[PDB]
């Protein structure tokens, strides 16, 4: 399995040790408190009240945890995924990213602690 | 595995199908939005700003997800637990509970969607 | 998980650390060479040519690996069990036993090397 | 997971649906009765009394179950593999094969029933 920190200010995202292959089943658990700028913190589901002003993922709130798998678009993670299977032709290294507007990561703070494992299949 | 809803207004908590036995390894993923009363919602980590005025679990925020295993005290769950093992002499049915002050559940709303599975061991 | 040897000459069998609980999924893999008395040795399926009379397990060949769960009757194991759930109401420690006629274990020789693990469930 | 039969008389072996990828943990359980020509049958460990000459796998007995991962050399399987990680740099489809001398498969008979699954990792 993989365990590590995803910094909210890391615009390129945190590459994991997990290479998602066809057929794989994965489980993700994400925890902790982070900010996209304000003097408040939100969990891995982000800020349900903040407008989307050009987020890297339009299917999750500002300040949410998302991922890319190889060459994929952003996929919501939020608090995690339980025994999850990717779409046809989605494969490669999993990168975890804090959901924010491109070029606005410099004022972000905090992190999420994330676990990923491959399940039985 | 078990999947189900934990209602924020359910003071007795939601009993699951998971009977935790000595040696078991479990994974929990919790998601969603709930309130302990106010016209705002919080995720399974609850409200980090709200004081503890007699919460059923003093190790988690008001509005967080917690659990009991058989005859145990409350144990924080928050967003989930990854490949977790219980203390010596903690065993029995897992019950999931919204963290609030006893007798104050009537104004709560929303729910968490929760998955629990037993891992390889 | 558990790994150990089951001696063919051990009439009482080898009690393991694995406690089979309701709902558990287990995998067993057994290997090696043993005899119920002749100079030949057989694997964990035993001797398909030997008559069935007086064996501790009528549903496996003489020289096969079998088990008990708690105080159950004998259950065939043979080369192993893949992601197995008990079809009967059984609970308790797994004991591994060589299948032979009671009182005839003293001329037996060799052993099986066995792995047991609990699977995801 | 994959379940199927490996015929002893099939020199090319049975290609499975399981693609072994770097880091995968697999479990294999094999059962049944087969012959490399004689009237006797043996289990998936084969015949411990048969000489080693000309077999497709020098590290297993004649009549044993072996495999290839992609275009690898033969790898012993015997009764199975418990939570196994490839110790060598191998990737690709698992092919299951009966261990015999090339060109001598036509007098073989019987089969092994095999389960393969990917384990948690
Ligand atoms: C149209 C517009 C106007 C103001 C901003 C803006 O200032 C801003 C700055 C951030 O650090 C930030 O994290 C976000 N966000 O999440 O939406 C917005 C961004 C876009
Ligand atoms: C000492 C005191 C004063 C006011 C209240 C109180 O009114 C209250 C009511 C709730 O529904 C509720 O969910 C909580 N809480 O989470 O703390 C407090 C509770 C205790
Ligand atoms: C050394 C040894 C140990 C066990 C056996 C053995 O299993 C055996 C011995 C007998 O006298 C017999 O009549 C039969 N039978 O009827 O199949 C089996 C045979 C030899
Ligand atoms: C009448 C009769 C027929 C078959 C057996 C018999 O099956 C048997 C099995 C053994 O493992 C064993 O060790 C021996 N023995 O050495 O005598 C006999 C035992 C008795
Ligand atoms: C029907 C059949 C099929 C295969 C065998 C067999 O494997 C065999 C045949 C031989 O002529 C021989 O010399 C040896 N050897 O040296 O061990 C083995 C024996 C019989
Ligand atoms: C010189 C020599 C010695 C041993 C073998 C031999 O091992 C063998 C193996 C077979 O599976 C088989 O089917 C046969 N056959 O029937 O001839 C022979 C083959 C050739
Ligand atoms: Ca920002
Ligand atoms: Ca309340
Ligand atoms: Ca005997
Ligand atoms: Ca042959």
- What is residue D106's three-state secondary structure? helix
Contacts of D117 in chain A (CB under 8 A): 120-121
Chain D environment of C81 (Cβ under 8 Å): 29
Cα–Cα distance between B26 and B30 in angstroms, integer?
13
DSSP letter at D45? B
Per the structure, the complete domain to which residue C35 belongs is given by: 1-121
C-alpha dist (Å) from residue B63 to A40, B3, B73: 17, 20, 17
- How many domains does chain A contain in total? 1
Q: Do D44 and C43 touch (CB under 8 A)?
A: yes
10 Å CB burial of residue D106 (0-12, 13-18, 19+) is: exposed
Entry resolution (Å): 1.3
Strands B80-84 vs B75-76: parallel, antiparallel or unpaired: unpaired
Residue for token pair 């920190």: A5
User: What span, in angstroms and rounded, lies between the C-alpha atoms of A64 and A79?
Assistant: 8
Whether C107 is in the pocket of ligand 3, judged by its Cβ within 6 Å, is yes
SS3 category, B33: strand
Nearest CA to ligand 1 atom 11: A104
Determined by X-ray
From B37, B52, B56, B99, the mutation candidate for ligand 2 (largest count of ligand atoms within 8 A of CB) is B37
- Choose among C44, C48, C115: nearest Cβ to D33: C48
Are the CB atoms for D65 and D6 separated by under 8 Å? yes
| Residue C30 CB neighbours (<10 A) | 26
Map residue C2 onto helix, strand or coil.
strand
Are D43 and D114 in contact by the 8 Å Cβ rule? The answer is no
Residue C49 zone, left/alpha/beta (φ > 0; ψ -120 to 50; rest) = alpha
Q: What dihedral do alpha carbons D50, D52, D55, D58 form, nearest 10°?
A: 130
Residues with CB under 6 A from ligand 6: D 36-37, 100-101, 104, 107
Q: Which residues contact D86 (CB under 8 A, 6 or more apart)?
A: D20, D24, D69
Q: What is the distance in angstroms between the Cα of B121 and the nearest Cα belonging to chain D?
A: 10
Q: Which chains touch A (3 or more CB pairs under 8 A)?
A: B, C, D
DSSP state of B86: P
């Amino acid at each position: 399995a993989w365990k590590g920190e995803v910094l909210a200010n890391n615009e390129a995202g945190q590459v994991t040790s997990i290479i998602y292959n066809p057929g794989d089943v994965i489980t993700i658990v994400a925890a902790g408190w982070a900010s996209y700028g304000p003097t408040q913190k939100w969990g891995p589901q982000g800020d349900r009240e903040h407008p989307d002003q050009g987020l890297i993922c339009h299917d999750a709130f500002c300040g949410a945890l998302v991922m890319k798998i190889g060459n994929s678009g952003t996929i919501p993670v939020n608090t995690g995924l339980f025994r999850w299977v990717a779409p046809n032709n989605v494969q490669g290294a999993i990168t975890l990213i804090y959901n924010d507007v491109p070029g606005t990561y410099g004022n972000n703070s905090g992190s999420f602690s994330v676990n990923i494992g491959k399940d039985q299949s």
